[PDB]
Amino acid sequence: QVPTRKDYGSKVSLFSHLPQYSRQNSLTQFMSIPSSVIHPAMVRLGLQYSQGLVSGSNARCIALLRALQQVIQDYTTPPNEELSRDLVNKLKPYMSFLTQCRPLSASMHNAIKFLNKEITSVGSSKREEEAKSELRAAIDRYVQEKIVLAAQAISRFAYQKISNGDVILVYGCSSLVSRILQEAWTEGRRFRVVVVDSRPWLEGRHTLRSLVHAGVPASYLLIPAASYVLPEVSKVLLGAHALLANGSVMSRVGTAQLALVARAHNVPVLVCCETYKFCERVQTDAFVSNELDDPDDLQCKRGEHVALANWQNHASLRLLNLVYDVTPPELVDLVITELGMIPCSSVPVVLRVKSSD
Amino acid sequence: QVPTRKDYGSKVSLFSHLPQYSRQNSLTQFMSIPSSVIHPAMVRLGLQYSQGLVSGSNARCIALLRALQQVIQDYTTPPNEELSRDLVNKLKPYMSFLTQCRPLSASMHNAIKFLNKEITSVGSSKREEEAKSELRAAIDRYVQEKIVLAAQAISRFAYQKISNGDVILVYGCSSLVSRILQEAWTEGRRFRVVVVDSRPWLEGRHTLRSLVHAGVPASYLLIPAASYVLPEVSKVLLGAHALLANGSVMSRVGTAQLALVARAHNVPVLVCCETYKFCERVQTDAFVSNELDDPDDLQCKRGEHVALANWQNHASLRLLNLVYDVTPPELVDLVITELGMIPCSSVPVVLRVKSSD
Amino acid sequence: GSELSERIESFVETLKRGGGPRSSEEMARETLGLLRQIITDHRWSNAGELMELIRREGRRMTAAQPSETTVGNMVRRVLKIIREEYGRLHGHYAQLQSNIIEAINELLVELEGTMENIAAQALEHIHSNEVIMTIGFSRTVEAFLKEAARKRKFHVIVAECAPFCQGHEMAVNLSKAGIETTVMTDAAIFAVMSRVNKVIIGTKTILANGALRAVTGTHTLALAAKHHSTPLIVCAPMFKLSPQFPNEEDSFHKFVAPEEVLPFTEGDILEKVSVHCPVFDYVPPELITLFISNIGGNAPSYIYRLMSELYHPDDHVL
């Protein structure tokens, strides 16, 4: 059986209901080396989630669908049982193990929902390997269109907005915004990018390398220098991880802050999100549902005087590094999807017209 | 000796540092009937403060100065001791007893400060009864000019603002704003007054009677109906109890709320305060220094189903009725003093030019 | 016939005199019972004749209490249901009647589990050690709080709606469940608003703009919450959603006797005073952040889609 991981450190009194684990210890210390309860591709996926090797919001969904292809390929049918019920009952502890490794992104939630809807609608007269081929082909078509065709459509719809001679501000690491910047630089736009990064992940270095390798002139700075440079910045690109029912933008933790400071400097912000990453779930703060990272990650070496080394010996000391927040929907201007340029109030509209209604 | 009154009820966790007493019990249960430690006029003053018989901000200062006249008239001089030190050392337990009866208004604080400054500056060559006559004449001149001449000046300065045909909104009970309305109605202005009241004091009935007896057409309503009538209201008069260093308005608890709703309906608010009620003390919220009224006052009889009768048996129930709050200085437009029409940012300016500088 | 017109007249005079019944869900259940009783014991040849009959019977209930929009928009929802049944049978006497019967029965099945679904999705909006502020009395918001406190520890500021202190009952009914509640007046709203983290209120009628009427003084709470930038949570069912535009028709507020504000024993000054007591108020949709219904959380920029999915544009006059 799969046990629960022990909560690490002293939690925030506002975040006592949310789990906070550590990357030092693993859950597979008390599991079999031939993976029998959990699928071996699923425990491989949980290891590359828990150690932080797959951090992008689209990369988690791609690796999730590849592991689901490896599970469905390694699926067998018992006697007098249907695939459309047994696969539903078997994939739930797999997703529970993946949730206990690392909290799921909403892209992965909608991927689980779409796969459950597809394996629910498999007919009883279909054979074993024929339904396996149908499910693998459905996953392949799904990842094919709703990654690369939506990415090309959002790239063209943002290419027809970015003009010549402007400056663009980005935050965090996202493959969609970086692909927009690369395909805007290659097709003829001449611009420079101000890259805003934040602690302790420091994931802005990835898109910094991606913009220098693409030939784009780049500028690198942090959250406090964004207030210094936004009087010169005319355009802000952002990478959204989830869009809610009210039009909120779930992204990295420095998103609503940067959008508020950009509106204070009259700089329009632009989030870029594909339509499968939407939510019928809604929240208004970063407190009722959020991911808790490592409390040992906030420490750094400024000289030889690391102060947060023995932070657990102080009883009145709390360590917190939030992953997700939400934006109020009156702060974000663009929502660039593959259907066209929509505002934030059109997210449940696109949910309705893409939910067969 | 004077003991401390027991705190009544279960205090608010934000208001644990502030005392909350009850009007049912008195402190003079364990005191002598010939008042020896406390002066008899001072214990009379504490009884008419604690029972709620003197509630106006100017009436407390007038009764305070009358009790101080009765104390200085009933003062004697011991051998080889100065009046300018012994009166200072004796008036401090009197003001401590008055503070333990009911928390002091800032008008009374400045009255204590001015009287201490005057009795400190009494020369040693002056006689007993001659200095008594000097102090009584100084208190008489002080209450004379800095009540009635400042009231007439603020009344004229508000009469030269109120035009014909407008509507005026008032809140709470204050003799200065009511005197402004009466002397505006008698000198030729034709207007009607919308009176806003609030629970549990219901002190708007006093100024309602004062406006009906003056011949003014009146309208009576509460806090939730103020949002209904402020689209028709063009002018709001308010009664300030203290003005701070940043320009905040300490008044009754429904003042900053009413000013925010009036600014939301584009209605300019007008506070009317005399210059002795100012403060070098400053606060930004209604939490660090405030008066706590009775928790048994919030209950009412709506039928025969009084729900807050046995409120102390519920452990998770808290009762709170705040007396004072502050306004942000960007919400209040007028500050009408006897020196002229000043904004909120001019309160420490008037403190400087009236503090011999 | 006789019992039908008797119960119709009783319901009309009950809405004319006061609030009967007290719960709005109970009044909605009696509204569906009245509509199924008026369709089961009458005769019609065309469906449009029944449409005109339901319109003529609904005009009297609208003119009985214009502030009670629940009976009117429930009549309008049943009109759209019968219109959709006539549309799916148009592209007819007993089959259409049985379809109306099973549809109104399904509407009661959906209506009995509204507060249950609101309490089911109550968990995704409340965290531990949280300061909540409410106004008035409503069963939906107190059910929200007493389900959210089953796994979370937080605080609720029960601000009374005071033309008549009905929020004391909400404070007692929460303190019996242990929500660590605090009681104050309407005059301390902005004074305590600097410590309030979220605003969770109910409503009486959701308008077509996303605007709402509720217990009075909540527009002040919405203005203070917009000043202090806290999100507003409106836990409201899907039968308080009406297509009546705010400035389109008159009689928005409901006026009661001025006795609850200023009593009869005041004296001779009652002759020269005008005391008005609105027990409701207007709240614009830009002062609202999120609506909570039984189907999920929705935006004030999304009420028009529920208006299109629940109501027909030829029925907005009724």
PDB file of N, CA, C and O in Angstrom, chain C residues 233-280:
ATOM      1  N   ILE C 233     -18.126  37.423  -1.512  1.00  0.00           N
ATOM      2  CA  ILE C 233     -18.690  36.116  -1.819  1.00  0.00           C
ATOM      3  C   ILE C 233     -20.194  36.184  -1.609  1.00  0.00           C
ATOM      4  O   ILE C 233     -20.663  36.445  -0.495  1.00  0.00           O
ATOM      5  N   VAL C 234     -20.955  35.961  -2.675  1.00  0.00           N
ATOM      6  CA  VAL C 234     -22.410  35.998  -2.621  1.00  0.00           C
ATOM      7  C   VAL C 234     -22.905  34.563  -2.751  1.00  0.00           C
ATOM      8  O   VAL C 234     -22.937  34.002  -3.851  1.00  0.00           O
ATOM      9  N   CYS C 235     -23.275  33.961  -1.621  1.00  0.00           N
ATOM     10  CA  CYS C 235     -23.836  32.613  -1.600  1.00  0.00           C
ATOM     11  C   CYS C 235     -25.330  32.735  -1.869  1.00  0.00           C
ATOM     12  O   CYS C 235     -26.115  33.035  -0.967  1.00  0.00           O
ATOM     13  N   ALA C 236     -25.728  32.504  -3.122  1.00  0.00           N
ATOM     14  CA  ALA C 236     -27.086  32.765  -3.558  1.00  0.00           C
ATOM     15  C   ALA C 236     -27.602  31.643  -4.452  1.00  0.00           C
ATOM     16  O   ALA C 236     -26.862  31.164  -5.331  1.00  0.00           O
ATOM     17  N   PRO C 237     -28.848  31.213  -4.272  1.00  0.00           N
ATOM     18  CA  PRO C 237     -29.399  30.155  -5.126  1.00  0.00           C
ATOM     19  C   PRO C 237     -29.761  30.679  -6.508  1.00  0.00           C
ATOM     20  O   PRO C 237     -29.653  31.869  -6.813  1.00  0.00           O
ATOM     21  N   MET C 238     -30.211  29.758  -7.361  1.00  0.00           N
ATOM     22  CA  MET C 238     -30.535  30.068  -8.746  1.00  0.00           C
ATOM     23  C   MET C 238     -32.016  30.361  -8.971  1.00  0.00           C
ATOM     24  O   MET C 238     -32.464  30.365 -10.124  1.00  0.00           O
ATOM     25  N   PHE C 239     -32.787  30.606  -7.911  1.00  0.00           N
ATOM     26  CA  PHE C 239     -34.140  31.113  -8.079  1.00  0.00           C
ATOM     27  C   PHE C 239     -34.304  32.548  -7.601  1.00  0.00           C
ATOM     28  O   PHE C 239     -35.406  33.097  -7.710  1.00  0.00           O
ATOM     29  N   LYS C 240     -33.248  33.164  -7.076  1.00  0.00           N
ATOM     30  CA  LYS C 240     -33.230  34.594  -6.808  1.00  0.00           C
ATOM     31  C   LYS C 240     -32.637  35.391  -7.964  1.00  0.00           C
ATOM     32  O   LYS C 240     -32.342  36.578  -7.800  1.00  0.00           O
ATOM     33  N   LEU C 241     -32.458  34.762  -9.120  1.00  0.00           N
ATOM     34  CA  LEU C 241     -31.874  35.394 -10.295  1.00  0.00           C
ATOM     35  C   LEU C 241     -33.016  35.822 -11.213  1.00  0.00           C
ATOM     36  O   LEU C 241     -33.769  34.979 -11.710  1.00  0.00           O
ATOM     37  N   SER C 242     -33.167  37.146 -11.412  1.00  0.00           N
ATOM     38  CA  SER C 242     -34.322  37.663 -12.134  1.00  0.00           C
ATOM     39  C   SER C 242     -33.895  38.606 -13.256  1.00  0.00           C
ATOM     40  O   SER C 242     -32.901  39.326 -13.110  1.00  0.00           O
ATOM     41  N   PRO C 243     -34.630  38.641 -14.369  1.00  0.00           N
ATOM     42  CA  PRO C 243     -34.284  39.546 -15.472  1.00  0.00           C
ATOM     43  C   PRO C 243     -34.786  40.973 -15.321  1.00  0.00           C
ATOM     44  O   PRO C 243     -34.723  41.726 -16.297  1.00  0.00           O
ATOM     45  N   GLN C 244     -35.289  41.372 -14.156  1.00  0.00           N
ATOM     46  CA  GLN C 244     -35.696  42.756 -13.955  1.00  0.00           C
ATOM     47  C   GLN C 244     -34.473  43.658 -13.861  1.00  0.00           C
ATOM     48  O   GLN C 244     -33.645  43.517 -12.957  1.00  0.00           O
ATOM     49  N   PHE C 245     -34.362  44.577 -14.814  1.00  0.00           N
ATOM     50  CA  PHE C 245     -33.293  45.556 -14.836  1.00  0.00           C
ATOM     51  C   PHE C 245     -33.497  46.577 -13.715  1.00  0.00           C
ATOM     52  O   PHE C 245     -34.633  46.825 -13.300  1.00  0.00           O
ATOM     53  N   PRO C 246     -32.392  47.159 -13.172  1.00  0.00           N
ATOM     54  CA  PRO C 246     -32.512  48.040 -11.994  1.00  0.00           C
ATOM     55  C   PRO C 246     -33.328  49.308 -12.205  1.00  0.00           C
ATOM     56  O   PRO C 246     -34.279  49.565 -11.458  1.00  0.00           O
ATOM     57  N   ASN C 247     -32.976  50.107 -13.208  1.00  0.00           N
ATOM     58  CA  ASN C 247     -33.668  51.369 -13.444  1.00  0.00           C
ATOM     59  C   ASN C 247     -34.856  51.235 -14.388  1.00  0.00           C
ATOM     60  O   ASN C 247     -35.422  52.259 -14.785  1.00  0.00           O
ATOM     61  N   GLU C 248     -35.252  50.014 -14.754  1.00  0.00           N
ATOM     62  CA  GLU C 248     -36.329  49.838 -15.724  1.00  0.00           C
ATOM     63  C   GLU C 248     -37.700  50.033 -15.086  1.00  0.00           C
ATOM     64  O   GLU C 248     -38.539  50.771 -15.616  1.00  0.00           O
ATOM     65  N   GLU C 249     -37.944  49.381 -13.955  1.00  0.00           N
ATOM     66  CA  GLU C 249     -39.225  49.454 -13.272  1.00  0.00           C
ATOM     67  C   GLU C 249     -39.060  50.162 -11.934  1.00  0.00           C
ATOM     68  O   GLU C 249     -37.957  50.265 -11.392  1.00  0.00           O
ATOM     69  N   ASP C 250     -40.178  50.651 -11.407  1.00  0.00           N
ATOM     70  CA  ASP C 250     -40.191  51.327 -10.120  1.00  0.00           C
ATOM     71  C   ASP C 250     -40.388  50.298  -9.009  1.00  0.00           C
ATOM     72  O   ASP C 250     -40.368  49.086  -9.252  1.00  0.00           O
ATOM     73  N   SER C 251     -40.587  50.791  -7.778  1.00  0.00           N
ATOM     74  CA  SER C 251     -40.766  49.992  -6.560  1.00  0.00           C
ATOM     75  C   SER C 251     -39.612  49.017  -6.322  1.00  0.00           C
ATOM     76  O   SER C 251     -39.836  47.821  -6.126  1.00  0.00           O
ATOM     77  N   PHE C 252     -38.378  49.520  -6.350  1.00  0.00           N
ATOM     78  CA  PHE C 252     -37.217  48.670  -6.107  1.00  0.00           C
ATOM     79  C   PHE C 252     -37.125  48.283  -4.635  1.00  0.00           C
ATOM     80  O   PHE C 252     -37.148  47.098  -4.284  1.00  0.00           O
ATOM     81  N   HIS C 253     -37.019  49.277  -3.757  1.00  0.00           N
ATOM     82  CA  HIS C 253     -36.911  49.033  -2.331  1.00  0.00           C
ATOM     83  C   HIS C 253     -38.280  48.692  -1.747  1.00  0.00           C
ATOM     84  O   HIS C 253     -39.324  49.049  -2.296  1.00  0.00           O
ATOM     85  N   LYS C 254     -38.264  47.991  -0.615  1.00  0.00           N
ATOM     86  CA  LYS C 254     -39.485  47.658   0.115  1.00  0.00           C
ATOM     87  C   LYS C 254     -39.527  48.518   1.369  1.00  0.00           C
ATOM     88  O   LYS C 254     -38.647  48.415   2.230  1.00  0.00           O
ATOM     89  N   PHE C 255     -40.541  49.368   1.467  1.00  0.00           N
ATOM     90  CA  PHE C 255     -40.690  50.259   2.607  1.00  0.00           C
ATOM     91  C   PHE C 255     -41.635  49.644   3.630  1.00  0.00           C
ATOM     92  O   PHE C 255     -42.682  49.098   3.271  1.00  0.00           O
ATOM     93  N   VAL C 256     -41.252  49.731   4.902  1.00  0.00           N
ATOM     94  CA  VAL C 256     -42.060  49.229   6.006  1.00  0.00           C
ATOM     95  C   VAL C 256     -42.429  50.407   6.895  1.00  0.00           C
ATOM     96  O   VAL C 256     -42.135  51.561   6.560  1.00  0.00           O
ATOM     97  N   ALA C 257     -43.112  50.125   8.004  1.00  0.00           N
ATOM     98  CA  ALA C 257     -43.496  51.169   8.945  1.00  0.00           C
ATOM     99  C   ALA C 257     -42.258  51.803   9.574  1.00  0.00           C
ATOM    100  O   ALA C 257     -41.256  51.115   9.805  1.00  0.00           O
ATOM    101  N   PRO C 258     -42.284  53.106   9.860  1.00  0.00           N
ATOM    102  CA  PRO C 258     -41.151  53.754  10.530  1.00  0.00           C
ATOM    103  C   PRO C 258     -41.083  53.527  12.034  1.00  0.00           C
ATOM    104  O   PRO C 258     -40.292  54.200  12.699  1.00  0.00           O
ATOM    105  N   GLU C 259     -41.886  52.605  12.575  1.00  0.00           N
ATOM    106  CA  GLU C 259     -41.887  52.332  14.008  1.00  0.00           C
ATOM    107  C   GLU C 259     -40.584  51.683  14.463  1.00  0.00           C
ATOM    108  O   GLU C 259     -40.110  51.955  15.573  1.00  0.00           O
ATOM    109  N   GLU C 260     -39.982  50.846  13.616  1.00  0.00           N
ATOM    110  CA  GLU C 260     -38.757  50.152  14.003  1.00  0.00           C
ATOM    111  C   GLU C 260     -37.557  51.092  14.022  1.00  0.00           C
ATOM    112  O   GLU C 260     -36.552  50.809  14.684  1.00  0.00           O
ATOM    113  N   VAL C 261     -37.637  52.215  13.305  1.00  0.00           N
ATOM    114  CA  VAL C 261     -36.557  53.194  13.339  1.00  0.00           C
ATOM    115  C   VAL C 261     -36.795  54.220  14.441  1.00  0.00           C
ATOM    116  O   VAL C 261     -35.929  54.452  15.292  1.00  0.00           O
ATOM    117  N   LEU C 262     -37.971  54.844  14.449  1.00  0.00           N
ATOM    118  CA  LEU C 262     -38.310  55.866  15.434  1.00  0.00           C
ATOM    119  C   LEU C 262     -39.676  55.520  16.009  1.00  0.00           C
ATOM    120  O   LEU C 262     -40.666  55.466  15.253  1.00  0.00           O
ATOM    121  N   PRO C 263     -39.789  55.284  17.316  1.00  0.00           N
ATOM    122  CA  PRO C 263     -41.027  54.716  17.863  1.00  0.00           C
ATOM    123  C   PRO C 263     -42.158  55.733  17.936  1.00  0.00           C
ATOM    124  O   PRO C 263     -41.997  56.921  17.649  1.00  0.00           O
ATOM    125  N   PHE C 264     -43.328  55.229  18.333  1.00  0.00           N
ATOM    126  CA  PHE C 264     -44.525  56.061  18.392  1.00  0.00           C
ATOM    127  C   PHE C 264     -44.519  56.963  19.620  1.00  0.00           C
ATOM    128  O   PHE C 264     -45.193  57.999  19.632  1.00  0.00           O
ATOM    129  N   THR C 265     -43.755  56.597  20.650  1.00  0.00           N
ATOM    130  CA  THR C 265     -43.671  57.358  21.891  1.00  0.00           C
ATOM    131  C   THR C 265     -42.630  58.471  21.840  1.00  0.00           C
ATOM    132  O   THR C 265     -42.155  58.901  22.898  1.00  0.00           O
ATOM    133  N   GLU C 266     -42.258  58.938  20.645  1.00  0.00           N
ATOM    134  CA  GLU C 266     -41.221  59.959  20.535  1.00  0.00           C
ATOM    135  C   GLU C 266     -41.730  61.331  20.959  1.00  0.00           C
ATOM    136  O   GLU C 266     -41.016  62.073  21.643  1.00  0.00           O
ATOM    137  N   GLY C 267     -42.956  61.681  20.581  1.00  0.00           N
ATOM    138  CA  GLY C 267     -43.543  62.930  21.026  1.00  0.00           C
ATOM    139  C   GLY C 267     -44.135  63.790  19.930  1.00  0.00           C
ATOM    140  O   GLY C 267     -44.604  63.281  18.908  1.00  0.00           O
ATOM    141  N   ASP C 268     -44.118  65.108  20.141  1.00  0.00           N
ATOM    142  CA  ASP C 268     -44.688  66.050  19.185  1.00  0.00           C
ATOM    143  C   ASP C 268     -43.810  66.265  17.957  1.00  0.00           C
ATOM    144  O   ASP C 268     -44.260  66.897  16.996  1.00  0.00           O
ATOM    145  N   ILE C 269     -42.574  65.758  17.966  1.00  0.00           N
ATOM    146  CA  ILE C 269     -41.679  65.976  16.838  1.00  0.00           C
ATOM    147  C   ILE C 269     -41.940  64.986  15.709  1.00  0.00           C
ATOM    148  O   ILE C 269     -41.308  65.079  14.650  1.00  0.00           O
ATOM    149  N   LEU C 270     -42.856  64.033  15.906  1.00  0.00           N
ATOM    150  CA  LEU C 270     -43.205  63.089  14.850  1.00  0.00           C
ATOM    151  C   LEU C 270     -44.042  63.728  13.752  1.00  0.00           C
ATOM    152  O   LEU C 270     -44.130  63.172  12.652  1.00  0.00           O
ATOM    153  N   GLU C 271     -44.659  64.880  14.022  1.00  0.00           N
ATOM    154  CA  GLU C 271     -45.479  65.540  13.011  1.00  0.00           C
ATOM    155  C   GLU C 271     -44.616  66.195  11.939  1.00  0.00           C
ATOM    156  O   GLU C 271     -44.960  66.169  10.750  1.00  0.00           O
ATOM    157  N   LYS C 272     -43.485  66.777  12.334  1.00  0.00           N
ATOM    158  CA  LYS C 272     -42.639  67.539  11.425  1.00  0.00           C
ATOM    159  C   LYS C 272     -41.386  66.780  11.001  1.00  0.00           C
ATOM    160  O   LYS C 272     -40.374  67.412  10.680  1.00  0.00           O
ATOM    161  N   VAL C 273     -41.421  65.450  10.992  1.00  0.00           N
ATOM    162  CA  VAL C 273     -40.287  64.640  10.563  1.00  0.00           C
ATOM    163  C   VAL C 273     -40.773  63.646   9.514  1.00  0.00           C
ATOM    164  O   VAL C 273     -41.952  63.266   9.501  1.00  0.00           O
ATOM    165  N   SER C 274     -39.884  63.281   8.593  1.00  0.00           N
ATOM    166  CA  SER C 274     -40.159  62.263   7.589  1.00  0.00           C
ATOM    167  C   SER C 274     -39.189  61.105   7.779  1.00  0.00           C
ATOM    168  O   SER C 274     -37.999  61.228   7.468  1.00  0.00           O
ATOM    169  N   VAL C 275     -39.698  59.985   8.288  1.00  0.00           N
ATOM    170  CA  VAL C 275     -38.873  58.831   8.628  1.00  0.00           C
ATOM    171  C   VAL C 275     -39.176  57.718   7.636  1.00  0.00           C
ATOM    172  O   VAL C 275     -40.286  57.168   7.636  1.00  0.00           O
ATOM    173  N   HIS C 276     -38.199  57.386   6.799  1.00  0.00           N
ATOM    174  CA  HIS C 276     -38.317  56.313   5.825  1.00  0.00           C
ATOM    175  C   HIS C 276     -37.408  55.160   6.225  1.00  0.00           C
ATOM    176  O   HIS C 276     -36.271  55.376   6.660  1.00  0.00           O
ATOM    177  N   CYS C 277     -37.911  53.931   6.079  1.00  0.00           N
ATOM    178  CA  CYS C 277     -37.189  52.725   6.469  1.00  0.00           C
ATOM    179  C   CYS C 277     -37.113  51.760   5.289  1.00  0.00           C
ATOM    180  O   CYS C 277     -37.978  50.885   5.134  1.00  0.00           O
ATOM    181  N   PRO C 278     -36.098  51.890   4.432  1.00  0.00           N
ATOM    182  CA  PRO C 278     -35.867  50.858   3.413  1.00  0.00           C
ATOM    183  C   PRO C 278     -35.185  49.648   4.035  1.00  0.00           C
ATOM    184  O   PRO C 278     -34.101  49.761   4.613  1.00  0.00           O
ATOM    185  N   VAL C 279     -35.822  48.484   3.916  1.00  0.00           N
ATOM    186  CA  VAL C 279     -35.208  47.257   4.413  1.00  0.00           C
ATOM    187  C   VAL C 279     -34.345  46.570   3.360  1.00  0.00           C
ATOM    188  O   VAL C 279     -33.791  45.497   3.632  1.00  0.00           O
ATOM    189  N   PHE C 280     -34.217  47.156   2.170  1.00  0.00           N
ATOM    190  CA  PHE C 280     -33.321  46.662   1.137  1.00  0.00           C
ATOM    191  C   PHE C 280     -32.472  47.819   0.621  1.00  0.00           C
ATOM    192  O   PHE C 280     -32.659  48.975   1.005  1.00  0.00           O
TER     193      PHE C 280
END
